[PDB]
Design a protein around this ligand. Structure first.
Ligand SMILES: [Mg+2]
Ligand SMILES: [Mg+2]
Ligand SMILES: [Mg+2]
Ligand SMILES: [Mg+2]
Ligand SMILES: [Mg+2]
Ligand SMILES: [Mg+2]
Ligand SMILES: [Mg+2]
Ligand SMILES: [Mg+2]
Ligand SMILES: [Mg+2]
Ligand SMILES: [Mg+2]
Ligand SMILES: [Mg+2]
Ligand SMILES: [Mg+2]
Ligand SMILES: [Mg+2]
Ligand SMILES: [Mg+2]
Ligand SMILES: [Mg+2]
Ligand SMILES: [Mg+2]
Ligand SMILES: [Mg+2]
Ligand SMILES: [Mg+2]
Ligand SMILES: [Mg+2]
Ligand SMILES: [Mg+2]
Ligand SMILES: [Mg+2]
Ligand SMILES: [Mg+2]
Ligand SMILES: [Mg+2]
Ligand SMILES: [Mg+2]
Ligand SMILES: [Mg+2]
Ligand SMILES: [Mg+2]
Ligand SMILES: [Mg+2]
Ligand SMILES: [Mg+2]
Ligand SMILES: [Mg+2]
Ligand SMILES: [Mg+2]
Ligand SMILES: [Mg+2]
Ligand SMILES: [Mg+2]
Ligand SMILES: [Mg+2]
Ligand SMILES: [Mg+2]
Ligand SMILES: [Mg+2]
Ligand SMILES: [Mg+2]
Ligand SMILES: [Mg+2]
Ligand SMILES: [Mg+2]
Ligand SMILES: [Mg+2]
Ligand SMILES: [Mg+2]
Ligand SMILES: [Mg+2]
Ligand SMILES: [Mg+2]
Ligand SMILES: [Mg+2]
Ligand SMILES: [Mg+2]
Ligand SMILES: [Mg+2]
Ligand SMILES: [Mg+2]
Ligand SMILES: [Mg+2]
Ligand SMILES: [Mg+2]
Ligand SMILES: [Mg+2]
Ligand SMILES: [Mg+2]
Ligand SMILES: [Mg+2]
Ligand SMILES: [Mg+2]
Ligand SMILES: [Mg+2]
Ligand SMILES: [Mg+2]
Ligand SMILES: [Mg+2]
Ligand SMILES: [Mg+2]
Ligand SMILES: [Mg+2]
Ligand SMILES: [Mg+2]
Ligand SMILES: [Mg+2]
Ligand SMILES: [Mg+2]
Ligand SMILES: [Mg+2]
Ligand SMILES: [Mg+2]
Ligand SMILES: [Mg+2]
Ligand SMILES: [Mg+2]
Ligand SMILES: [Mg+2]
Ligand SMILES: [Mg+2]
Ligand SMILES: [Mg+2]
Ligand SMILES: [Mg+2]
Ligand SMILES: [Mg+2]
Ligand SMILES: [Mg+2]
Ligand SMILES: [Mg+2]
Ligand SMILES: [Mg+2]
Ligand SMILES: [Mg+2]
Ligand SMILES: [Mg+2]
Ligand SMILES: [Mg+2]
Ligand SMILES: [Mg+2]
Ligand SMILES: [Mg+2]
Ligand SMILES: [Mg+2]
Ligand SMILES: [Mg+2]
Ligand SMILES: [Mg+2]
Ligand SMILES: [Mg+2]
Ligand SMILES: [Mg+2]
Ligand SMILES: [Mg+2]
Ligand SMILES: [Mg+2]
Ligand SMILES: [Mg+2]
Ligand SMILES: [Mg+2]
Ligand SMILES: [Mg+2]
Ligand SMILES: [Mg+2]
Ligand SMILES: [Mg+2]
Ligand SMILES: [Mg+2]
Ligand SMILES: [Mg+2]
Ligand SMILES: [Mg+2]
Ligand SMILES: [Mg+2]
Ligand SMILES: [Mg+2]
Ligand SMILES: [Mg+2]
Ligand SMILES: [Mg+2]
Ligand SMILES: [Mg+2]
Ligand SMILES: [Mg+2]
Ligand SMILES: [Mg+2]
Ligand SMILES: [Mg+2]
Ligand SMILES: [Mg+2]
Lengths: 74, 49, 63
RNA sequence: UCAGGGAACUGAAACAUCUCAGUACCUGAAGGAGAAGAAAGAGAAUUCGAUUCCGUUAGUAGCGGCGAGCGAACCCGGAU
RNA sequence: GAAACGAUGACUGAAUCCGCGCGGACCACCGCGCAAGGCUAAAUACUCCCAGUGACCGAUAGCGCAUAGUACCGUGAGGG
RNA sequence: UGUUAUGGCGUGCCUAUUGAAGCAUGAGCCGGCGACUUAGACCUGACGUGCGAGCUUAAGUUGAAAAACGGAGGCGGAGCGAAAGCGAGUCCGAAUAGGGCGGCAUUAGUACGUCGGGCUAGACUCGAAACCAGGUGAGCUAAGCAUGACCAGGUUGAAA
RNA sequence: AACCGAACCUGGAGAUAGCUAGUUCUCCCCGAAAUGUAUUGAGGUACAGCCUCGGAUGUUGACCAUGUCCUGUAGAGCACUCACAAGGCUAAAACCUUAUGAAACUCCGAAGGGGCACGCGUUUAGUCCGGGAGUGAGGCUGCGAGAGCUAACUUCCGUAGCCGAGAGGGAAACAACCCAGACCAUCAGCUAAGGUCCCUAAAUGAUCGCUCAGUGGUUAA
RNA sequence: GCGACUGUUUACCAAAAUCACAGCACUCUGCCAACACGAACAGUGGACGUAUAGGGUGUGACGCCUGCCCGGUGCCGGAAGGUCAAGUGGAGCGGUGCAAGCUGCGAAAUGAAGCCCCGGUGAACGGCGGCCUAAGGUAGCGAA
RNA sequence: GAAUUGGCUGUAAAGAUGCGGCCUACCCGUAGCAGGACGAAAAGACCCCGUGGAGCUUUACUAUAGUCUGGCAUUGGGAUUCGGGUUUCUAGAAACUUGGAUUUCUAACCUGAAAAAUCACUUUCGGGGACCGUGCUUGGCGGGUAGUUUGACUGGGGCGGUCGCCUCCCAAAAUGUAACGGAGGCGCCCAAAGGUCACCUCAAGACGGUUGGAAAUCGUCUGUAGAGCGCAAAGGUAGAAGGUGGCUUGACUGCGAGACUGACACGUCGAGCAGGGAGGAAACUCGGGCUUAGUGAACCGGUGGUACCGUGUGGAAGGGCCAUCG
């Protein structure tokens, strides 16, 4: 039963951070479910990674615990 | 042997195969869909073989 | 003298261009495939990067 | 030089095909040389014109566990 | 290998100039050539031997030997 | 300069190593011999020379107290593609999304030479256990064969 | 034919040798690695990562400040899951007062850490194109953890510094500890760690106390 | 205790309980024998021998004796059926020719030995067990 | 190695004449002894390592001497029954067979005796006999022989375990991070568990209720959730991804601006463009599934298209491209 098992690192985390200029198609956070939630200007991939539609300054919205959003300001 | 299988699709007079077959568990003999070969139109795909 | 390694030629590694080494895209050869339709298509023509010096002298005369 | 026989270490980062190599070695025959030589050819121009040697073709065309690696000929320029 | 052509070991086994062989499975056309008889100098290789030469040695170098296949070792092949 | 007394200080050399005065390797001493080379019209760079949108010869011929000749051929000059092929365009494709590429930065190339690397070949020098080929050995020793030789003296007491 | 699990001699033959050993003149400049992936791989190689040389660019580098977002460790807490201490209530789960533990618990949650902008400020490295590498056995201490007996000059990761390649002073001696990074000369001066009775450079220093054990100069219940 | 016995061995650390040995047993072998050396339709050895002989294997004077298990493997027989190569066969499928013809494949049926399959065989390889396998220790011995 | 070579105790790579402190010791020999100089000798035979070797073994792999076997050749007439061939002729049979098969024959061939020992010759002669032997080929057997293979991690090796993928601690509040550390899953599923359109909202407890009564089923009230999501956990989820129906396939072809991640090679997410669909009244959403596991480069080949190559030309064999399978 000696159990030497484990699983390769998943480079999950917040990629682009607050006040970074971004581009269309940049991947802005990696997550399992929706810790951070889509928000305006921002799509969300099939694996729940949200990502930019438009270019510009980035996000910052976090009052709802379990209700936090990313966004893009032209 | 096996349950689920691979199965070729053949166009109503086209060519284009598409070989994404699913279970023999409940589709005991059924296998018809629709998608376009080389003519632009979506057409009927009998997935017999 | 100096052979070309004929494992380079009709294999991926076109030598061509401004001296840079194109190669192909690999997985899902004709080994079996269900899998996605946007990967079965995205297997056309790649091009490598930090190995080129090795690839070049495989085939420096561009066969 | 030609012929009758014909290895293995080795490389393939193991080893069978493969390579090493028709190499080493043994044997036969002959001479100052020898072999080869006068197209049922090369080859794609209805071109060429016995053989041998050198340059180049060209590491091209190809061969190959299509792996390691092996590798021509024609045209053309010379010696005769 | 789609593997032609030459090559023999075994068994078979044609045709004549409106004929025979090839042109890389094979076919037609179109081309190239006359097999199963022989000889054939020169351009090529090599260095026991001789001559000349050397950004070759000069006595632990240079051939093993400034001479020796000697002394010496071995039953020998052989080494030296 | 030579040599001394006395004070202070002071753990051979190399190699191999996390770590050597090491009680870890090597070595008695001195002399001499002794190890990154060569090759090829091979690749790829640095530096230098000649000629430059063009550069250059190979085999050879003729001359040699000397070198000229020799364009066969090699490198630039067009790219994209599996290829046929098109061609400053090309490939994928039913057109518009891309890959590579020319423009613009036209970095200018080529033949030599010296050098740094690479490849191939003993490839920095020395060191196997082993594998294969053709020979030499049964004058030692293991055996066989043919022909010869040898065994003081004493005790025991079988068949018939 | 004085070494027979396969004789001796000569030849292939300079077999092959990811293995050992050895690799010689001089000064100057820079200066590493023992990490990560893959490997019939583990003491070998390939690609990265760190060195150097040349070219291009030209502060893009470095600390430090301000602004902004990201985080669930320390601590803490019991509101979920598990464990769990004394009572009441009752057919005992549950429920109430009191009370706790947690790497795989979290109603909370720092210091720190990272990304971006700015340079509001001092510095001087950076990046890209090429030629040459070596390295891929690391070790010790403090801190943070697992494995271990809360052993080990143990082992395996993280993190800083030293040795590795670091001479000099201190620690009696002493790679790692303390101070400090050796261009060359001087029979000149100041300090650091650490010292000032004699070996042994320098107060038998000054003022308050303490210990009469050689405690100093060897653990505890 | 072991081996019956004389004898033989590790030249150079083992002389023995090792080897051989008389005796016994299985099997093979009809004579250009089996078997063995051999490039060889050569020649030899067996052997100028012929089954009371020769080869091979294992036991090991002599005495009393040598038990159970043919499933597996080996071997000897069987040889209804299954499988199986070259060859014979060439129905049919294609190219290429205007055609004649040339040409690439190519079946069914029939083709040996062998193996599957069935019997036997132990002085054939062997096996005689753990609180189903083919059977499970006959005599004799036993802390060797 | 060179030596001008003492004792204790301490340190140093951990057993010190040689480093530190302290003790002892005038210079040099001769006869003796055997504690030390990790004394000498053989670059450890144990052990581990090397993708080293060699001897041997077998039901490891692969060949092969040897040997058995079918066909053909040497190799020949005959009689006999002949599945059949051809011209023969009042379903039919004589010239004849292409053969197979017992049977039989003697000129091949083998072998033996006779003044001529191996061989050659006649043989009144003898026996075997188209078998054997031999030559090519087919298949079997073939440790007799031969060339080789026989992984790695590993608190020494072996034995046991373990080799890829996913989840959570460890992992030190960014990503990352080892251990033969601690836990647990995958090598699939789903013709609907997918697209869209529309509509419902779950556990759990309390009172009351037909056989059930701790728990079936209904009914009321509580009810950020204490459920569920195909499976492992973690995140996430109440405006749903959960539970239910209607239509249908976007479980699409041609592409891919930009980024996450990796030494590569792979891997991930993807707005938007075209052809054509699907659901919706529309806006709009569709290029599989809440997400993270359900996986294999290359080589060689099978199957379907395409008409690029195809060696004098025109084809075809063969090859390439696209799709798929192993
Ligand atoms: Mg286990
Ligand atoms: Mg190209
Ligand atoms: Mg070999
Ligand atoms: Mg090899
Ligand atoms: Mg071989
Ligand atoms: Mg020679
Ligand atoms: Mg000769
Ligand atoms: Mg002669
Ligand atoms: Mg000519
Ligand atoms: Mg022909
Ligand atoms: Mg021929
Ligand atoms: Mg032709
Ligand atoms: Mg000289
Ligand atoms: Mg001499
Ligand atoms: Mg001398
Ligand atoms: Mg000599
Ligand atoms: Mg002598
Ligand atoms: Mg003599
Ligand atoms: Mg002195
Ligand atoms: Mg050590
Ligand atoms: Mg030291
Ligand atoms: Mg010493
Ligand atoms: Mg020493
Ligand atoms: Mg050593
Ligand atoms: Mg010594
Ligand atoms: Mg050249
Ligand atoms: Mg040449
Ligand atoms: Mg461009
Ligand atoms: Mg040059
Ligand atoms: Mg290199
Ligand atoms: Mg070599
Ligand atoms: Mg030999
Ligand atoms: Mg003798
Ligand atoms: Mg006498
Ligand atoms: Mg007497
Ligand atoms: Mg001897
Ligand atoms: Mg002697
Ligand atoms: Mg030997
Ligand atoms: Mg050598
Ligand atoms: Mg050789
Ligand atoms: Mg080797
Ligand atoms: Mg410096
Ligand atoms: Mg990996
Ligand atoms: Mg390593
Ligand atoms: Mg590197
Ligand atoms: Mg620079
Ligand atoms: Mg920067
Ligand atoms: Mg800056
Ligand atoms: Mg805590
Ligand atoms: Mg509160
Ligand atoms: Mg500034
Ligand atoms: Mg570089
Ligand atoms: Mg260099
Ligand atoms: Mg390491
Ligand atoms: Mg470490
Ligand atoms: Mg513990
Ligand atoms: Mg340690
Ligand atoms: Mg080191
Ligand atoms: Mg340092
Ligand atoms: Mg120091
Ligand atoms: Mg010091
Ligand atoms: Mg000191
Ligand atoms: Mg100390
Ligand atoms: Mg220390
Ligand atoms: Mg030091
Ligand atoms: Mg002072
Ligand atoms: Mg001070
Ligand atoms: Mg003083
Ligand atoms: Mg005082
Ligand atoms: Mg006893
Ligand atoms: Mg005896
Ligand atoms: Mg002896
Ligand atoms: Mg002897
Ligand atoms: Mg003795
Ligand atoms: Mg005979
Ligand atoms: Mg005889
Ligand atoms: Mg016995
Ligand atoms: Mg018995
Ligand atoms: Mg007793
Ligand atoms: Mg100590
Ligand atoms: Mg001591
Ligand atoms: Mg001392
Ligand atoms: Mg001293
Ligand atoms: Mg003595
Ligand atoms: Mg050793
Ligand atoms: Mg081997
Ligand atoms: Mg045979
Ligand atoms: Mg055969
Ligand atoms: Mg063997
Ligand atoms: Mg076998
Ligand atoms: Mg191992
Ligand atoms: Mg983290
Ligand atoms: Mg951290
Ligand atoms: Mg690590
Ligand atoms: Mg643990
Ligand atoms: Mg829904
Ligand atoms: Mg509609
Ligand atoms: Mg889209
Ligand atoms: Mg096909
Ligand atoms: Mg053609
Ligand atoms: Mg075709």
């Amino acid at each position: 039963s000696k159990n030497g098992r484990d699983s390769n690192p998943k480079y999950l985390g917040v990629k682009k951070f607050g006040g970074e200029v971004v581009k269309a198609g940049n991947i802005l956070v990696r997550q399992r479910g929706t810790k951070f939630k889509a928000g305006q200007g921002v799509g969300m991939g099939r694996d729940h990674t949200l990502f930019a539609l438009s270019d510009g300054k980035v996000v910052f919205i976090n009052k709802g615990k379990g209700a936090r959003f990313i966004s893009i300001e032209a | 042997p096996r349950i689920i299988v691979k199965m070729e699709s053949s166009a109503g007079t086209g060519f284009y195969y598409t070989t994404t077959k699913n279970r023999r568990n409940t589709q005991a003999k059924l296998e018809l869909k629709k998608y376009d070969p080389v003519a632009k139109k979506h057409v009927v795909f009998r997935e017999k073989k | 003298p100096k052979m070309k390694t004929h494992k380079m030629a009709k294999r991926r590694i076109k030598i061509t261009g401004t001296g840079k080494v194109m190669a192909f895209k690999s997985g899902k050869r004709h080994q079996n495939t269900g899998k996605s339709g946007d990967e079965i298509r995205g297997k056309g023509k790649g091009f490598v990067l930090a190995k080129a010096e090795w690839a070049r002298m495989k085939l420096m005369l561009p066969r």
